[PDB]
């Protein structure tokens, strides 16, 4: 074992697991999911005495993993995962998922043209997850046409600015609980324009962080066995956090 030395001892045998998923979505204007995937990694931070043999178990039956490499120390086959981890922080596994992804937010855009002069836009977001969980760091980014003289917005939650240099309205919300709805309206004031070329309407995109794996993955157990030393599994202090963040998360209209 060239990844972990042999004299390692800790008063407090403790490990930390991070499940870090980025969830990607391309959604049609009429709500069809055009494309969706999740990339994830499990990072482990372990302060464990000796040369312990852990078994990592999750609900891979109950979700479907489409492939994934592991860390050198993983013993290859419920065909569950086995290893002696390096001390400190390392990447346990990396994975991909396409089936049965929880799409934490739903974006519902509504767009109305007022002659040649104004666009009326309403955008609704819906959080799709347990009410006890908060999403945070939410941005909705609404692209505006190149011939935009100015923008008025109203929204009850958050703050929104027109950012002319980037041709987008950006709406930010610090936190938002599962199973809710929020909306923004904007009046976009148009300059006159070359009648011929139509507006090539980029999607509305989102940023967010959520405290669960959007793939549905959960950690069931991480079992520690070091059989020379006089600690056992139930002496180990175990922590998990899940951090699901948006990758490319777009809704067309």
């Amino acid at each position: 074992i060239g990844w972990r030395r042999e004299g390692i001892k800790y008063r407090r045998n403790e490990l930390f697991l991070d499940v870090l998923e980025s969830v990607n979505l391309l959604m049609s204007p009429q709500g069809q999911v055009l494309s969706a995937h999740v990339s994830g990694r499990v990072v482990m931070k372990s302060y464990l005495s000796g040369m312990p043999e852990c078994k990592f178990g999750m609900n891979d039956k109950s979700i479907a993993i489409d492939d994934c490499t592991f860390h050198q120390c993983v013993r290859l086959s419920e065909r569950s995962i086995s290893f002696i981890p390096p001390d400190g922080e390392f990447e346990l596994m990396r994975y991909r998922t396409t089936k049965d992804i929880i799409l934490p937010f739903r974006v519902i855009p509504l767009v109305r043209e007022v002659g040649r002069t104004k666009l009326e836009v309403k955008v609704v977001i819906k959080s799709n997850f347990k009410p006890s969980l908060l999403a945070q760091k939410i941005e909705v980014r609404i692209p505006t046409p190149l011939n935009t003289s100015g923008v008025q917005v109203i929204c009850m939650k958050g703050k929104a600015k027109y950012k002319a240099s980037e041709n987008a309205i950006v709406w930010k919300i610090k936190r938002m609980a599962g199973m809710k709805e929020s909306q923004i309206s904007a009046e976009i004031e148009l300059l006159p324009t070359n009648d011929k070329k139509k507006w090539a309407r980029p999607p509305i995109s989102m940023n967010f962080e959520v405290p669960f794996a959007p793939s549905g993955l959960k950690v069931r157990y991480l079992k520690v066995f070091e059989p020379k030393l006089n600690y056992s599994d139930h002496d180990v202090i175990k922590w998990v956090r899940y951090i699901g963040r948006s990758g490319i998360y777009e809704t067309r209209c």
Binding site: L17, N59, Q136, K218, V219, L222, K238, W239, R241
Partner: peptide
């Protein structure tokens, strides 16, 4: 969103 939960569940 980035708080450690103690123990693993299912």
């Amino acid at each position: 969103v980035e708080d450690y939960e103690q123990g693993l569940s299912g």
